[PDB]
Design a protein around this nucleic acid. Structure first.
Lengths: 129, 149, 86, 217
RNA sequence: GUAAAGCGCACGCAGGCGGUUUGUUAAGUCAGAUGUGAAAUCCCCGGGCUCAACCUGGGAACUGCAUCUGAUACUGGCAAGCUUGAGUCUCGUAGAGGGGGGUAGAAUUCCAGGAAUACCGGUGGCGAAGGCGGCCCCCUGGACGAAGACUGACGCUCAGGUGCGAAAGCGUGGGGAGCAUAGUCCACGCCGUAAACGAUGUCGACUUGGAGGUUGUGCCCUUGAGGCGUGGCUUCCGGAGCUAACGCGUUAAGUCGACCGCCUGGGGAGUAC
């Protein structure tokens, strides 16, 4: 990317959700390992392998259950220059809470249940559905 | 059984070498009150024969849509080719606070508790296409959980 | 211009061999190649086409001087001593 | 399997919707492999007989030229249906009024099964043989039919994709054989076998027909 | 993109916006309380007028600002780095990019010379646009390719701002054929105008494609006019997706991100002051 590494990643993934390729790959900062170690665990994709040490870079495995593809409607919201630092008792539940809401907390990125369990919100990263 | 409903009827003309031959259109939907809905379209040269042919158009091609509590549960946005439809799930006992064409498709699904809005164009041919796409895109909590894990 | 007199001015500024694009070596090569090109615009005085190509690198001459300014105030003054700038 | 015989046709100009099923190009043409298709040469037979045990009807939609005899080889001797010639628009979705176009026919069959064709003196009976040439052309395996086709079988997906476009429209399973340069995403039970080369088109139709008599069980 | 709407085009100042790793601070933000947000209205359980309006007890809420304590994932200032964004060097390659200088005919009126290409000349090709075509040298402009090398974010964008600005007109100084009687033509000054219409800001990254253009250059009996790549830009039809259609469609208008210009019914009107 030039001027957001995480926004321009989220174009790269769901273009794989429009031709149903197997593996996708983007140049991977240490933040970017902490991105898809949430999407795997909540079940939206399957497996990933970092590789490279002068170009640290990922091998994400997609997940399309049918002709239907699992990662339906992912959206970045906090785009740079429009930071929305949510207080935690405003929190965006995604699609009546049926999805997950990736929030950049202190204690990590892994965020469904920061509403009650962790107990501190922050900058939204992206809605996920 | 099923349940019909009209939408409208126009004053569709035509032009031949002689004069102005008219026609009539007939927009209907069909849905049994349990979740499956369908629609059709049919013309004629008079009024009542148009309905008769368009009513069978909807008695096939009824699409499978699941409901939750006589209502929707999660806010899909529906758009089809001229118009935007914004359906928010709401409480029980709320009526279908809705505009034109989607009233006909919601009181045939079994849907009875939705507040919703038509956002842009108000042309009832293209409105009734969108909300059927709006209910097509939805997912029940079974479709949530069984697909992700 | 590009090959001959640049080859005698390259090692006049390098902290070692082949450090060519370092910012000290950069501007002193470049500012030299604005004086000599201004001999070409000492006359001809109607080449409004090429004059922006001069106007291109005169602004970039001030651009990399900011990179000396924001990093090392010492090395900034050292080459504008050796070039007599501003 | 037997596909040392049949491997390739259909030169370089291609559709890139057929990415997985192609093994790889070899001298300005691609090779049809075995690894993704030898399963579907007998995954199909897991679905032939159980559909046939519903007292089935399998329309061999075969409007190619090489499949003139090559699709009626063991088709109706195994008691199934076939059309090895021209195609009516909607032989499923418009079939009920094709039966109306047999309501024209089987009362005029009474002229043939009886000797009552002598009526309507022979200047009239000059032109009356011209339907009798042509009504029994496209209506071959449909006079013995009494119902909707209980399955569907298009043999090739580049000639009768007009038919497939109407076949996928109303939801009947299709045991197709698609080509290397197709629009394959209509037939949801798909085989990229060699659907050219008249020697090879017998090698699937006779391969199915050895079992479908036992398919009805 | 055609419905009102992308300045004619360029670098850029103040503005807005960050590749990549570690340290660190705690302003941005999250958390916790403690202050404080006058009472009355709004809101929820409860009282009183024969009910209701209305009067009313307590709560919640007043989305706020200031302070201590905490948190280090994002972001931000300080410190330290690494190679892909960018950029300099080497090295070749192709070319109506210009400026000056003279040159001079495949051609062409008068009694001398004003003009500027016939051919190549085209779907070529240059350039930021208006644009620019005889020939050779002179000072200069940009891009491209093949490798190496090192710089370590040094960048992208733009209100004003300043330049370059088709014709004519006008100024001052001449000419007079091709042919419009100055003017057209060179030139020094004003003038900034237009279908200055890809009626398509800019850069970046991603996604089914197919055939031709042209510039290279690696491998391969180069054994060749030639294949597979592999660069760059420009055509021609077309998937998904999109669009009111018509259509766009790896040079986007498709999925996005940062930033700038502009429009909000027609006439009066690009007019009044």
């Amino acid at each position: 990317s030039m001027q957001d590494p995480i926004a321009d990643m989220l174009t790269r993934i769901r273009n794989g959700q429009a031709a149903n390729k197997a593996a996708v790959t983007m140049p991977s900062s240490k933040l970017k390992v902490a991105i898809a170690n949430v999407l795997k665990e909540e079940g939206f994709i399957e497996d990933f392998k970092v590789e490279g040490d002068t170009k640290p870079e990922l091998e994400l495995t997609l997940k399309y259950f049918q002709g239907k593809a699992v990662v339906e409607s992912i959206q970045r919201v906090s785009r740079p220059g429009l930071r929305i630092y949510k207080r935690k008792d405003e929190l965006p539940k995604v699609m009546a809470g049926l999805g997950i809401a990736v929030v950049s907390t202190s204690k990590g990125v892994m965020t469904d249940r920061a509403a009650r369990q962790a107990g501190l919100g922050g900058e939204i990263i992206c809605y996920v559905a | 059984e099923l349940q019909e409903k009209l939408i409208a009827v126009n004053r569709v003309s035509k032009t031949v070498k002689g004069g102005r031959i008219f026609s009539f259109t007939a927009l209907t939907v069909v849905g049994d009150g349990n979740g499956r809905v369908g629609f059709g379209y049919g013309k004629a040269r008079e009024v009542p024969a148009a309905i008769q042919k368009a009513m069978e158009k909807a008695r096939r091609n009824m699409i499978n849509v699941a409901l939750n509590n006589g209502t929707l549960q999660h806010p899909v946005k529906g758009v089809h080719t001229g118009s935007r439809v914004f359906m928010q799930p709401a409480s029980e006992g709320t009526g279908i606070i809705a505009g034109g064409a989607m009233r006909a498709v919601l009181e045939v699904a079994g849907v009875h508790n939705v507040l919703a809005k038509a956002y842009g164009s108000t042309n009832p041919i293209n409105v009734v296409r969108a909300t059927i796409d709006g209910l097509e895109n939805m997912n029940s909590p079974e479709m949530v959980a069984a697909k992700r894990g | 211009l590009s090959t001959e007199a640049t080859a005698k001015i390259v090692s006049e500024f390098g902290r070692d061999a082949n450090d060519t694009g370092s910012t000290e070596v950069q501007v002193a090569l470049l500012t030299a190649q604005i004086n000599h090109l201004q001999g070409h615009f000492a006359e001809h005085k109607k080449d409004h086409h090429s004059r922006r190509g001069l106007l291109r690198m005169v602004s970039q001459r001030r651009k990399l001087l900011d990179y000396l300014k924001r990093k090392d105030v010492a090395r900034y003054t050292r080459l504008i001593e050796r070039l007599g700038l501003r | 399997l037997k596909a040392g015989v049949h491997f390739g046709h259909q030169t370089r100009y291609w559709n890139p919707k057929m990415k997985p099923f192609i093994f790889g190009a070899r001298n300005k043409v691609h090779i049809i492999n075995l690894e993704k298709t030898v399963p579907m040469f007998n995954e199909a037979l897991a679905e032939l007989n159980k559909i046939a045990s519903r007292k089935g009807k399998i329309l061999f939609v075969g409007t190619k030229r090489a499949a003139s005899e090559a699709v009626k080889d063991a088709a109706l001797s195994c008691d199934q249906f076939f059309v090895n010639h021209r195609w009516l628009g909607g032989m499923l979705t418009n079939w009920k009024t094709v039966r109306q176009s047999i309501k024209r026919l089987k009362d005029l069959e009474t002229q043939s099964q009886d000797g009552t064709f002598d009526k309507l003196t022979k200047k009239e009976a000059l032109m009356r043989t011209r339907e009798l040439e042509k009504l029994e052309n496209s209506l071959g395996g449909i006079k013995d039919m009494g119902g909707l086709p209980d399955a569907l079988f298009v043999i090739d997906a580049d000639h009768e994709h007009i038919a497939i476009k109407e076949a996928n429209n109303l939801g009947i399973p299709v045991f197709a054989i698609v080509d290397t340069n197709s629009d394959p995403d209509g037939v949801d039970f798909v085989i990229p076998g060699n659907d050219d080369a008249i020697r090879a088109v017998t090698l699937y139709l006779g391969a199915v027909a050895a079992t479908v008599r036992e398919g009805r069980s």
